Design an enzyme around this catalytic site. Structure first.
Site, short mmCIF file in Angstrom:
data_model
loop_
_atom_site.label_atom_id
_atom_site.label_comp_id
_atom_site.label_asym_id
_atom_site.label_seq_id
_atom_site.Cartn_x
_atom_site.Cartn_y
_atom_site.Cartn_z
N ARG A 13 24.81 29.37 -30.80
CA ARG A 13 24.76 30.39 -32.02
C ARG A 13 23.91 31.68 -31.51
O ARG A 13 22.83 31.27 -31.02
CB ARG A 13 24.19 29.84 -33.35
N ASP A 57 20.80 42.27 -17.89
CA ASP A 57 19.88 41.27 -18.37
C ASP A 57 19.68 40.11 -17.52
O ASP A 57 20.13 38.84 -17.83
CB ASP A 57 20.76 40.79 -19.77
CG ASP A 57 19.95 39.75 -20.35
OD1 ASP A 57 18.62 39.71 -20.38
OD2 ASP A 57 20.36 39.02 -21.10
N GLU A 80 28.94 33.49 -32.36
CA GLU A 80 28.70 32.18 -32.37
C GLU A 80 29.89 31.96 -31.25
O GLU A 80 30.92 32.29 -31.10
CB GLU A 80 29.50 31.70 -33.79
CG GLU A 80 28.51 32.03 -34.81
CD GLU A 80 29.13 31.13 -36.12
OE1 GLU A 80 30.47 30.97 -36.28
OE2 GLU A 80 28.33 31.01 -36.92
N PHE A 109 24.12 37.75 -32.31
CA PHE A 109 25.41 38.64 -32.82
C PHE A 109 26.78 37.74 -32.68
O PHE A 109 27.71 38.24 -33.24
CB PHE A 109 25.57 39.73 -31.79
N1 LIG Z 1 29.98 31.24 -20.67
C1 LIG Z 1 29.12 30.43 -21.34
N2 LIG Z 1 29.46 29.05 -21.30
C2 LIG Z 1 28.66 28.22 -21.89
N3 LIG Z 1 27.83 28.58 -23.02
C3 LIG Z 1 27.49 29.79 -23.24
C4 LIG Z 1 28.29 31.15 -22.40
N4 LIG Z 1 27.79 32.12 -22.67
C5 LIG Z 1 26.55 32.08 -23.81
N5 LIG Z 1 26.74 30.65 -23.90
C6 LIG Z 1 25.70 30.06 -24.96
O1 LIG Z 1 25.86 30.66 -26.19
C7 LIG Z 1 24.45 30.86 -26.69
C8 LIG Z 1 24.33 32.16 -27.39
O2 LIG Z 1 25.22 33.11 -26.77
P1 LIG Z 1 24.22 34.56 -26.59
O3 LIG Z 1 24.60 35.01 -25.01
O4 LIG Z 1 22.87 34.32 -26.88
O5 LIG Z 1 25.10 35.60 -27.61
P2 LIG Z 1 24.46 36.86 -28.01
O6 LIG Z 1 23.20 37.21 -27.40
O7 LIG Z 1 25.61 37.83 -28.17
O8 LIG Z 1 24.15 36.21 -29.56
C9 LIG Z 1 23.36 30.56 -25.71
O9 LIG Z 1 22.63 29.43 -25.87
C10 LIG Z 1 24.31 30.27 -24.41
O10 LIG Z 1 23.56 29.28 -23.65
#
Ligand SMILES: Nc1ncnc2c1ncn2[C@@H]1O[C@H](COP(=O)(O)OP(=O)(O)O)[C@@H](O)[C@H]1O
Ligand SMILES: [Mg+2]
Ligand code: NI
Length: 259
Positions: free
Chosen positions: A22, A141, A27, A25
């Site tokens: 989660r 980032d 899910e 921004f």
């Molecule tokens: N390519 C991926 N494979 C597996 N898990 C992912 C991947 N990208 C993001 N996540 C997981 O999703 C969760 C939240 O995503 P995030 O990158 O924080 O999205 P946002 O910052 O847009 O909310 C994180 O805990 C991350 O570990």
């Protein structure tokens, strides 16, 4: 219903297996492409409930630049598309952990990461970033949690209050390539010290940065080469920082002659 002509660009071609994340921004789900059985991460974003015309242009233009990237150490962007009033981003699944957790392991074992092991992972990270820079794409980032590692030890530079704040970013100057270099150097330091160099607000952080108020790495565990590479990457002055190609060349030399 399955749509074979649509490749990775339609939800009908994926089966959702589990919500695995989660975000602020988004899910994030684990899913499989029904066409070829490839497992993927699927992000769903309510960009219409959070973004505006202008932002959607910037974000979507950026994502489209990102889908052109193609390298073993960079998370693959298979597809992105609007569906169900959402931005769906289909990404390479990176499921086994990351650098942030590797660093926790060592801390827990009360052990430092051997220099040889630091280079083993750092050189892959440099490979990733040189690819991005060669394609004129800034990462934006770089941080340990965003540096996934597969079960086989392969680095996967993950998808783009920031973890590493560069001086130009602190002062709202434009992020640019030298800013990636700054993050890269902080990360190398963190691998060796198990803490950020500047581990606390932005004014005091700015103070520290302008005065290189960070504890030195122990010279009995880490070579002059490793320590100088840190020093030059986190130079406050972007123009004093080396390009990614120089950093990569050192990493390769050091990886070669420590393994
Ligand atoms: N390519 C991926 N494979 C597996 N898990 C992912 C991947 N990208 C993001 N996540 C997981 O999703 C969760 C939240 O995503 P995030 O990158 O924080 O999205 P946002 O910052 O847009 O909310 C994180 O805990 C991350 O570990
Ligand atoms: Mg988040
Ligand atoms: Ni300042």
């Amino acid at each position: 219903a399955l749509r074979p002509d649509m490749g990775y660009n339609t939800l009908a071609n994926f089966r959702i297996e589990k919500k695995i994340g989660r975000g602020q921004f988004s899910e994030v789900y684990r899913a499989a492409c029904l066409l070829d059985g490839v497992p993927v991460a699927l992000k769903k974003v309510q960009i219409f409930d959070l973004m505006d015309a202008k932002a959607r242009a910037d974000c979507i233009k950026e994502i489209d630049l990102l889908k052109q990237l193609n390298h073993p150490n960079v998370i693959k962007y298979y597809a992105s598309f609007i569906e169900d009033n959402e931005l769906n981003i289909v990404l390479e699944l990176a499921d086994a952990g990351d650098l942030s957790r590797m660093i926790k392991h060592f801390k827990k074992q009360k052990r430092l990461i051997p220099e040889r092991t630091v280079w083993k992972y750092f050189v892959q990270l440099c490979s990733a970033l040189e690819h991005m820079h060669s394609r004129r794409v800034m990462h934006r980032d770089i941080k340990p949690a965003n540096v996934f590692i597969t079960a086989t030890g392969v680095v996967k530079l993950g998808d783009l209050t920031p973890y590493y704040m560069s001086p130009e970013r602190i002062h709202e100057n434009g992020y640019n390539f030298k800013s990636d270099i700054w993050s890269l150097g902080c990360l190398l330091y963190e691998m060796a010290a198990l803490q950020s160099p500047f581990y606390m607000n932005l004014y005091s952080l700015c103070k520290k940065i302008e005065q290189c108020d960070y504890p030195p790495l122990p010279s009995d565990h880490y070579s002059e080469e490793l320590r100088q590479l840190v020093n030059m990457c986190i130079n406050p002055d972007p123009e004093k920082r080396p390009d990614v190609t120089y950093v990569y060349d050192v990493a390769k030399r050091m990886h070669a002659c420590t393994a």
